[PDB]
Symmetry: C3
Subunit: 343 residues, 3 copies
Amino acid sequence: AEIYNKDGNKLDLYGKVDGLHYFSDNDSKDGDKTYMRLGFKGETQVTDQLTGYGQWEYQIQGNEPESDNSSWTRVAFAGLKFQDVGSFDYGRNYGVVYDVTSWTDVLPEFGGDTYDSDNFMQQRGNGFATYRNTDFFGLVDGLDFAVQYQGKNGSAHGEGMTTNGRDDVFEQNGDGVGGSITYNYEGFGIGAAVSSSKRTWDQNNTGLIGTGDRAETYTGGLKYDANNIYLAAQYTQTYNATRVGSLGWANKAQNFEAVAQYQFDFGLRPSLAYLQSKGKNLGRGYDDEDILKYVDVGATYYFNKNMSTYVDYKINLLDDNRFTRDAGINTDDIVALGLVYQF
Amino acid sequence: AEIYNKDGNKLDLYGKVDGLHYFSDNDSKDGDKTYMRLGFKGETQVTDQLTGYGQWEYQIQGNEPESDNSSWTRVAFAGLKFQDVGSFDYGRNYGVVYDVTSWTDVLPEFGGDTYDSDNFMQQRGNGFATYRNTDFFGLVDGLDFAVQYQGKNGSAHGEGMTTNGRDDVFEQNGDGVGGSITYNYEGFGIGAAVSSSKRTWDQNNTGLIGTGDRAETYTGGLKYDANNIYLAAQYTQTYNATRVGSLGWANKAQNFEAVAQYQFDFGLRPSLAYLQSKGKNLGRGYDDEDILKYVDVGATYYFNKNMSTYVDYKINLLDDNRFTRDAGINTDDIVALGLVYQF
Amino acid sequence: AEIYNKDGNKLDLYGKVDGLHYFSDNDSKDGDKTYMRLGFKGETQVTDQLTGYGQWEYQIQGNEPESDNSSWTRVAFAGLKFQDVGSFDYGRNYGVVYDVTSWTDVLPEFGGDTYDSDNFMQQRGNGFATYRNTDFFGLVDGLDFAVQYQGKNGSAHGEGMTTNGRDDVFEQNGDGVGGSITYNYEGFGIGAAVSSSKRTWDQNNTGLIGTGDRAETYTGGLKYDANNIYLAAQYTQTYNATRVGSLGWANKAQNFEAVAQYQFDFGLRPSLAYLQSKGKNLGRGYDDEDILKYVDVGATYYFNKNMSTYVDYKINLLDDNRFTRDAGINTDDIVALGLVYQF
Ligand SMILES: CCCCCCCC[S@@](=O)CCO
Ligand SMILES: CCCCCCCC[S@@](=O)CCO
Ligand SMILES: CCCCCCCC[S@@](=O)CCO
């Protein structure tokens, strides 16, 4: 909600409370999942064509006792935007791969998990410097592109250390570069993205699988968003980038996400999605294994812009086998039931 | 404070800073206790008779250094309210036992501690699904009732695990059911509450006292709230529900709280309260011991709705003995001195 | 930003996002340093001459992954202000030594580090009770003084324990008393401050250097703040108060900070500063060592009140030697590059 707008600056304070419950045969995926998000979007008019902005978003879990409550920053960045030239922002933000893969990340509860947070330039992560050009200098409405640099987020000790270092190797990265191009026209969307990150010393020298010099993602995507119908698909082919449970990363992975949705006038929105991640030549005796594979059927009912409720059913297609147990990958179904207020 | 109210949605952002200091012979209860609370109450008009709402409240301690600052969510829930039918909400919220025991939880600093947070359905806890009926379908002004379900909040590992699991057994619970009825009329209040929770495997198989299949509370309460006078009393009889320091829980407990207050026109509000918790047949050689017992004398001076200061004197009536030392229960006096800004 | 002002109470919700990056040969000082701050300033008119107030400020780091995000309260206090008499506030707040040393704490990124947080009464710390007199009862415009008491912030276990205890001895303190006087007139500022804190048992009995009965600071300061020119200097002489890396504290220390700045009309603000901390008779074989010593050259460009960017270059003058390695003191340069949105 816009709670301030005065003398050239405005501030949107926004958030939500999701009363959320998971039902699953997997005990680790069963029970209260209530949480909230809080954020602000600030924007200031410097001149006719130049605006400064800042954004911050924070998740606070609501399913924990008061002795040990968990929370974190999703994004936190500042930037500058010049009309018919472009923008620059820096901070914790989304990787440019997500400019395309976000198109399928629209399920009621699940989805968007053929990749993780702090997972190279694929989703949210630290220290992105992002240059964006919107509508090609105002000459081609709908044509957007971005170039993105991610600085090294290293270890918390020893060699390859950064000031914001982290001992979990799955959350580290070296210097990376990425780009995205997208074109939207009368509801039809088409986009490509590419990212290339250096892998740090710790992630290649701790005995995990999917070691190598660089992490790489190549993404293509298509969507249709008009007349109350939402169709989208994305295919990403990764190298040393996709996480495989606890085992490490996938030498090669082929990720595919597809979604179909329809918005009824009275507020009902049914959703059918298919997500899949295929590990190829994973090593460690596993050759070719499904890292992820499930069908998602669900529905959100929008009371209005400020309130909704939804059910989401993750029909898990993975087999319980040696690879999934070793990696610690869930192969059980999850049904999500949620009640959501937002402002 | 209402910082937003527009096109059918309003948002109250509220909070306070309590500059607070404790004086006690017990070193663990002596010193700076400064803290703040922050929250929002959001509410949206869906129709003439249907409203959606969300609430979130957060405590941030202000008495710690910057290397290690502690904070937690008190409540976080969403819900729906239909006029002359009732409400439903879900999330971290207060247990329905508190619909009655809150009546004595009105002291300046102390009080309200014959029970804890995350202590079955007695106070704040995770995953409450709460149905409420207000004024009996609009036919009996003052008559309220509630039915409440709390889902299992289990361990963080092994058997009886939940996704929001917790290794502290005092903060766990199994499935529980509770109800409350209250009637208020021209300042006079009368109420009863009942709760029945299943106890998890860990809380019955870790060597503690007060083990058993279910936790149970039966509460009665009376109050008078009119003509600047506040009188209230509550009596709760619990089984395997009341915490006894570190020892475990009380097989049986008899809890009683009584308060008397008077609001002077110029802003002074003196308070006299008596709290007591009697453990019966506690085992471990005890067998009948006071778990809690103190008289509280205090006063709050309200400068206005936004500012006040208070002194609160917990005259501790417990004897320093084997049970209290073993349980780790404070038997020393505490004087609280506080300065409070709120909005 | 003032987001509420109604019926005698107003509330300023403020904050910023600093997209920040450090470049240094020291790996521990190199990389993403993005962070945000959030706070509110509340103030209520009780009468014509009496106002109640509350303030709270919070830092949330933006350079960490979502599994482990760090945050803390900077200040949290309530108080009362009577016109032409003075104010009283209590809580986590700034020590009165800072009434003078803040004058040099105005660099774009660095500076203000001849002392720490939770470092006796020198900067931010817990449990300050602060009495302030502004303009000497309204009889001498510009003449301010303060008396301040800090209650014991002790250990988290054993002897010398407080309820808000802390096991890091560098963040503990005993009872302390401090005072400040300042005089400002047509841009010219002059001030003195004195503080005297008791050192706790743990800080004198854990093998560190700079042990002794009391911590003491004596501070003098001068400044000029007018006609777009900012000049300021502070000299503090401390005893058992200044931190020396991990080694302990400095028996005696001589701290000096000097700054020169100029505000161009078009928004550029160049800054040149010199900071220095000289340890005297440190013991442990060290004798006389520079604890801190660097020159700071930098510049902030203000787009407007809500947006800016800056570069800050810490030219480190310390030699890499036995003392600096043992203490773990950085002797490498740091260049800071920041983009900042604030409201
Ligand atoms: C789409 C914009 C192309 C990226 C160019 C950025 C070059 C880095 S520059 O902005 C910093 C100068 O050191
Ligand atoms: C008039 C009904 C009394 C309240 C009982 C609530 C039952 C919960 S049920 O509707 C959810 C399980 O499907
Ligand atoms: C002349 C003003 C003196 C300021 C110091 C106040 C003394 C502390 S006292 O008021 C609290 C002990 O009860």
